Amino acid sequence: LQQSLELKRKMLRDKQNKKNSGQHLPIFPAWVYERPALIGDFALPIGTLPLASQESAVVEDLLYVLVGVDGRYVSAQPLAGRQSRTFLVDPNLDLSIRELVHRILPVAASYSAVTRFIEEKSSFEYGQVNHALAAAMRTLVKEHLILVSQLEQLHRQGLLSLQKLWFYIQPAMRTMDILASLATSVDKGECLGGSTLSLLHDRSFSYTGDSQAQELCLYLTKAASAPYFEVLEKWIYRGIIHDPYSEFMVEEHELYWDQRYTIVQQQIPSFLQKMADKILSTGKYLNVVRECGHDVTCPVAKEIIYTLKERAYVEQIEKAFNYASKVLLDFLMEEKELVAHLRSIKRYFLMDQGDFFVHFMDLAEEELRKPVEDITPPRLEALLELALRMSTANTDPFKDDLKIDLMPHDLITQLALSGLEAFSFDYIVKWPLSLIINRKALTRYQMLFRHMFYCKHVERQLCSVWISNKAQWFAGAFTLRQRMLNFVQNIQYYMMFEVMEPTWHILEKNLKSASNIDDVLGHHTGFLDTCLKDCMLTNPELLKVFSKLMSVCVMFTNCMQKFTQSMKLLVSGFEATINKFDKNFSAHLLDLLARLSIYSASVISRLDFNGFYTERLERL
Amino acid sequence: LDVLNKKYSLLDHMQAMRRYLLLGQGDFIRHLMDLLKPELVRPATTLYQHNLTGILETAV
């Protein structure tokens, strides 16, 4: 049947391209399929004989058809379209026995399509588990041929009769018919690797009561787990996966964390579905330490073996998740530490240090005011490098990593302006510690800094106007300035000592109690995501009330004040602008506190430490 | 009835239920009625959850 070759042609064609690292995969010589004798299937007038002579002549030929050979009277017609080989009892035979043969002949047909399984699924292409399904179903064909002979030894002495055989061949119309079922089901649809190991752990529960047959299904399926478990005794214990024919559930893409290793759902064998997640985990963790050297050896290695109702094939996988993902987590924690690096991220990105910020701002202020395309990138990389060398922030070792980025957008990116609002920072990270603090984590860290910038930027200007004035008789702006100071000095006490300092303490404790990289990449995902949500950053309106209050404030600090446009260094026109600004400020200030009440306490809880401005007006 | 008893608590939460919700404490419900008097004697509509929540913390 050529159609078979096409199935074979497709299997090999698909296999080769998937991996060309190993070439010339084994292929059987052609003469094997072409010659028909490797596989099993291929005078006196009966009418005038004595009845007993008919029974002893039939018992003689039937004893031949039980093995794959034609008989002088019972014979096989060509299969043609119908797969099972129906037979042609010689015509004009006793009508008493013609019926009895049809009760013993159903054995040679449940054997005709059982060697046709073993003499097909021997091909390497059919897989490394379809292989032993059909080479541990060969030992059964050897016992069968032993029985057919022992019965001839009785036939030789006149001691076997159609009835005696009918009792004798009953044991082999089941032990060889369970085999003619798995064979027409593994073949049905198609099955390779784990899919076959699940069709032999389904047809095992169905026959859970017969017992005569249950043990045979368990011998067939305790033998087909032998190839796969050797592969799962590697990916679980050392990172290497052999997988020569794409059989294993965890394939490895050439390309990392997202796509290098992937669970293939159809191939997953049924009895590991619950523990499939643990398998991928233990190996991925073992591989990232095995490319940088270190140690991949497992102190205890055991031979995971199949069983039914007593499963150690769900236990040894756990003594591997609890060693592999506990050696990786501690490698990261004392070599290529992320406890120390995280502190040298907090020191600059989260504005913890105060020395670095005061020395730097003054040194770069002249350049900072300039519009972009007039900015000097090398001069900003030189000025940063010094501001750091002069600060107390010189002492820490991981500082060299800081670099200056240039986000064209200024929180507008959230979905050509001034240097003050185009100042970004990127801290370079090595491949081993990158796994946790990846590009996604740093970008959000970057956004938290860009917003914290304005609040730091305005605080220095108010303090700037206060000294310039203290010509000095005017006391109109001595109060509007005072009110702005309370909100922008109390936002920086609420943000710094509630949203960031306690939450950072909650991550630095939770990291000491972590179990795996899956757990750790969570807590750091935690502090970054949850702390950003507590600050005003997370709002659909983005609390633009904050955006328009800081824009108008700068209008008061420099756009209008301009240090009194150097009046100290007129018509009361600036007293009208103070008034116009004061009413814009009250409207905007109200919108925020009301928004703080309507959406999701402490900033309101203490701004009114003595009911100050308790209700200038009440909405609706 | 030992896990639910300790890891999570059925006994501790069923007994404090006597005090906080059923008024079993008495000492606490007197203080709550001497601080929440003025805000309650207001009209109903004006009040909002954040207002009422605030007080509970002081008395506990």
Q: Is B48 in the A-facing interface, judged by CB distances under 8 Å?
A: yes
Q: Which of A597, A601, A605 sits opposite B48 (nearest CB)?
A: A597
As a whole number of angstroms, the longest Cα–Cα distance in chain A is 146
C-alpha separations of A199 from A84, A178, A285, A308, A485 in Å: 21, 13, 31, 14, 75
CA A217 to chain CA centroid, nearest Å: 34
**Which residue of A lies nearest to B47 if distances are taken between CA atoms?**
A618
The amino acid sitting at A183 is A
Asked if residue A286 lies in contact with residue A296, where contact means CB atoms within 8 angstroms, the answer is yes
Q: Can you tell me the distance from the alpha carbon of A581 to that of A576, in angstroms, rounded to the nearest whole number?
A: 8
How is A393-442 classified by DSSP, letter by letter? Answer: GGSSGGGGGEEEE--SSSSTT----BGGGS-EEEE---HHHHTTS-HHHH
Task: Please report residues of A whose CB lies closer than 8 A to that of B50.
Answer: 597, 601
Task: Please report residues of A whose CB lies closer than 8 A to that of B54.
Answer: 605
Query: Measured between CA atoms, how close is B10 to chain A, in angstroms?
Result: 27
**Which residue of A lies nearest to B45 if distances are taken between CA atoms?**
A620
Q: Can you tell me the distance from the alpha carbon of A423 to that of A331, in angstroms, rounded to the nearest whole number?
A: 35
Q: Is B49 in the A-facing interface, judged by CB distances under 8 Å?
A: no
Please report which residue ranges of A470-500 form alpha helices under DSSP H.
477-494
Contacts of A479 (CB under 8 A, 6+ apart): none
Asked if residue A75 lies in contact with residue A90, where contact means CB atoms within 8 angstroms, the answer is yes
Query: Measured between CA atoms, how close is A619 to chain B, in angstroms?
Result: 10
**Which residue of B lies nearest to A605 if distances are taken between CA atoms?**
B54
Name the token pair of A285. Answer: 């963790």
Q: Can you tell me the distance from the alpha carbon of A407 to that of A210, in angstroms, rounded to the nearest whole number?
A: 73
Mutation target to probe the B interface, by most B beta carbons within 10 A, among A595, A597, A617 is A597
Asked if residue A224 lies in contact with residue A200, where contact means CB atoms within 8 angstroms, the answer is yes
Q: Is A597 in the B-facing interface, judged by CB distances under 8 Å?
A: yes
Name the method of structure determination. cryo-EM
H or E stretch at A262: strand A261-263
C-alpha separations of A73 from A45, A60, A164, A166, A445 in Å: 10, 9, 20, 18, 88
Give the residue carrying structure tokens 């949500």. A533
Contacts of A515 (CB under 8 A, 6+ apart): A325, A326, A329
H or E stretch at B1: none
Q: Is B50 in the A-facing interface, judged by CB distances under 8 Å?
A: yes
Query: Measured between CA atoms, how close is A620 to chain B, in angstroms?
Result: 9
Nearest to A193 by CA among A10, A450, A324, A11: A11
Asked if residue A160 lies in contact with residue A172, where contact means CB atoms within 8 angstroms, the answer is no
What residues form DSSP beta bridges with A333?
none
Give the residue carrying structure tokens 């009301």. A594
| 3-state SS assignment for residue A250 | strand
What residues form DSSP beta bridges with A263?
A250
Burial class (CB in 10 A: 0-12, 13-18, 19+), A50: exposed
Q: What secondary structure, in 3-state letters, does A63-91 show?
A: HHHCCCCCCCCCCECCCCCCCCCCECCCC
- How many cross-chain Cβ pairs, A to B, lie less than 8 Å apart? 5
Query: Measured between CA atoms, how close is B3 to chain A, in angstroms?
Result: 23
Nearest to A338 by CA among A510, A499, A511: A511
* Orientation angle between helical segments A51-65 and A139-156, nearest 10 degrees: 160
Asked if residue A517 lies in contact with residue A329, where contact means CB atoms within 8 angstroms, the answer is yes
Name the token pair of A415. Answer: 């979905």
Name the token pair of A288. Answer: 């990232």
| 3-state SS assignment for residue A444 | helix
Mutation target to probe the A interface, by most A beta carbons within 10 A, among B39, B50, B52, B53 is B50
Name the token pair of A19. Answer: 């991996």
Q: Is B58 in the A-facing interface, judged by CB distances under 8 Å?
A: no
User: Measured at the alpha carbon of residue A486, what is the angle toward residues A481 and A492, in degrees to the nearest 5?
Assistant: 125
The amino acid sitting at A579 is N
Name the token pair of A65. Answer: 């058809």
How is A123-164 classified by DSSP, letter by letter? Answer: SSTT-SSHHHHTTSSSHHHHHHHHHHHHHHHHHHTT---HHH
Nearest to A296 by CA among A327, A253, A321, A264: A327
Name the token pair of A552. Answer: 């108008």
Asked if residue A103 lies in contact with residue A201, where contact means CB atoms within 8 angstroms, the answer is no
DSSP A298: -
End-to-end CA distance of chain B: give it in Å, rounded.
31
Q: Can you tell me the distance from the alpha carbon of A504 to that of A538, in angstroms, rounded to the nearest whole number?
A: 18
As a whole number of angstroms, the longest Cα–Cα distance in chain B is 49
Query: Measured between CA atoms, how close is A597 to chain B, in angstroms?
Result: 7
How is A177-212 classified by DSSP, letter by letter? Answer: TSHHHHHHHHSSS---THHHHHHTTTTTTTTTTTST
Asked if residue A526 lies in contact with residue A444, where contact means CB atoms within 8 angstroms, the answer is no
Query: Measured between CA atoms, how close is A618 to chain B, in angstroms?
Result: 9
Q: Is B48 close to A601, i.e. CB distance below 8 A?
A: no
CA B15 to chain CA centroid, nearest Å: 14
